[PDB]
Amino acid sequence: GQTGNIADYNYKLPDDFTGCVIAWNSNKLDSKPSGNYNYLYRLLRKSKL
Amino acid sequence: NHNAQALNTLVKQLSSKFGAISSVLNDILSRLDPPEAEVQIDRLITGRL
């Protein structure tokens, strides 16, 4: 039931989703002084996913 | 008369809100997100049943 850029254009949890969302910090591994440009996301699309 | 009265009462109870945002279902569907709109529609359905 949450709407946002990531939710609508990248990945949408279904309305009746069953499960657990697991998140943890990854600054140690996924961050570099040069910059982790490898990861991408989408912010422009014709219609919601 | 009673029969007619009953019918009118029934129709009038379509305009009541039953603690929802509004009586019109389209207004609730447009204004609120489906996860939030489900609760309002549930209240209206219970009242009309």
Strands, helices and their partners?
The structure is cut from a larger assembly and holds 2 copies of chain A (49 residues).
Chain A: H1 5-9, H2 27-30
Mind explaining what this structure looks like?
The structure is cut from a larger assembly and holds 2 copies of chain A (49 residues). The first copy, chain A, has helices at residues 5-9, 27-30. The first copy, chain A, has 49 residues and is mainly alpha-helical. The interface between A and B is small, with 3 and 4 residues. Chain B: It comes from Severe acute respiratory syndrome coronavirus 2. Chain B: This is Spike protein S2'. Chain B: Residues 1-41 form a coiled coil. The PDB classes it as hydrolase/viral protein.
List keywords for this structure.
2 chains, 49 residues, part of a larger assembly, mainly alpha, SARS-CoV-2, hydrolase/viral protein, Omicron, Spike protein S1 (chain A)
* Number of discrete helical segments of chain A: 2
Query: Radius of gyration of chain A from the CA trace?
Result: 14 Å
Structural class of chain A: mainly alpha
Biggest sheet record of chain A:
none
The most extensive interface, with participating residues per chain, is: A-B, 3 and 4 residues
Summarize this, please?
This is part of a larger assembly, with two copies of chain A (49 residues). Chain A has 49 residues and is mostly helical.
